[PDB]
């Protein structure tokens, strides 16, 4: 039994990418599905599409990387070099609007969860709201 539904996903994407898999599956759910909507509009992952496996819903996240490199260790740079969880369970981290994070000096987002859908540091600030700081990706 999972303890933190999201964190699970984030990680499942994290390791997934470290071994360069083409895409990984993760338990479906509105939220996660809305959380991946961002990683997708933002370029960290080609995309996700509702899929079934054994009979239970899952989400196929098609990871995105870069080009192969020159010299030793030719593996492709990472698109999601880092993807942490901020607001863990039993640690709820909600930030005001003036408390929203800047994240990797604009090189990365920070998915918030404001009472106005799931937005990113940008949007959320643009709309003028704050809320549970779900994660930080770069």
């Amino acid at each position: 039994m999972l303890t933190d539904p999201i964190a699970d996903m984030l990680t499942r994407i994290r390791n997934a990418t470290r071994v360069y898999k083409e895409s990984t599956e993760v338990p479906a759910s509105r939220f996660k599905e809305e959380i991946l909507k961002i990683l997708a509009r933002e370029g960290f992952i080609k995309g996700y599409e509702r899929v079934e496996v054994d009979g239970k819903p899952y989400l196929r996240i098609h990871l995105k990387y870069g080009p192969r490199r020159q010299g030793p260790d030719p593996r492709p740079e990472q698109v999601i070099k880092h993807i942490r969880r901020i607001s863990r369970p039993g640690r709820r981290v909600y930030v005001g609007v003036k408390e929203i994070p800047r994240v990797r000096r604009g090189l990365g987002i920070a998915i918030l969860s404001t009472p106005k859908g799931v937005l990113t540091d940008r949007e959320a600030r643009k709309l003028g709201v704050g809320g549970e700081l779900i994660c930080e990706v770069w």
């Binding site: 039993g90 640690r91 709820r92 981290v93």
Partner: protein, 104 residues
Amino acid sequence: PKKVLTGVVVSDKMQKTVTVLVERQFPHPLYGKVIKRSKKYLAHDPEERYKVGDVVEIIEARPISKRKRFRVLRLVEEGRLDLVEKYLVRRQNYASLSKRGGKA
């Protein structure tokens, strides 16, 4: 405006009096984790109408003794031993920590 608080009676032993439990909830001054603490307030039952485990609301008022300074406006659910059982069960514990020495 007089503050209203919503809690759960937990003892009707006294006359015209009811012990209400107010659970509050706030993030840490230095850890932001959410937290729950509680306080027992002593409000007046001039009608003896409120009984065990009734979920009531409370208001500030003319002190009516050492500790009692609130009242019981009106109901919010006429029955829930569910929570009273928790408090009663917390105390039950103390009764057993240190001294008695179950080891002797």
